[PDB]
């Protein structure tokens, strides 16, 4: 039964591949440093 063994192995390979795809660590490294560079200042009527 090579066909059934091949299908299980390929289905396993797909299932391992999907598990690897979500295996990660999300990070939030976007602080408010750019907000400190948006100092809106009024033009003075010289």
């Amino acid at each position: 039964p090579w066909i059934m063994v091949f299908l299980v192995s390929m289905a396993l390979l797909w299932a391992i591949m999907t598990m690897v795809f979500f295996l990660y660590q999300p990070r939030s490294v976007s602080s408010a440093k750019g907000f400190s560079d948006r100092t809106v200042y009024l033009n003075w009527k010289w």
């Binding site: 602080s31 408010a32 440093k33 907000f35 400190s36 948006r38 100092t39 809106v40 200042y41 009024l42 003075w44 009527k45």
Partner: protein, 53 residues
């Protein structure tokens, strides 16, 4: 960063409040020039009368 951005906006509002005193400074700058020109003529008139004397 949010606290700093608040304080920066506070300074921006205060600079808008000081725009009025800049306008008064411009008004006094015009009045100072008109005084210095008119009073020098008053000094020049007095010097011309002294020159005639």
């Amino acid at each position: 960063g949010f606290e700093e951005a608040i304080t920066l906006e506070e300074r921006a509002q205060k600079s808008a409040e000081a725009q009025i005193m800049l306008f008064q400074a411009k008004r006094e700058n015009v009045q100072f020039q008109l005084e210095a020109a008119y009073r020098a003529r008053l000094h020049h008139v007095n010097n011309e009368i002294k020159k005639r004397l």
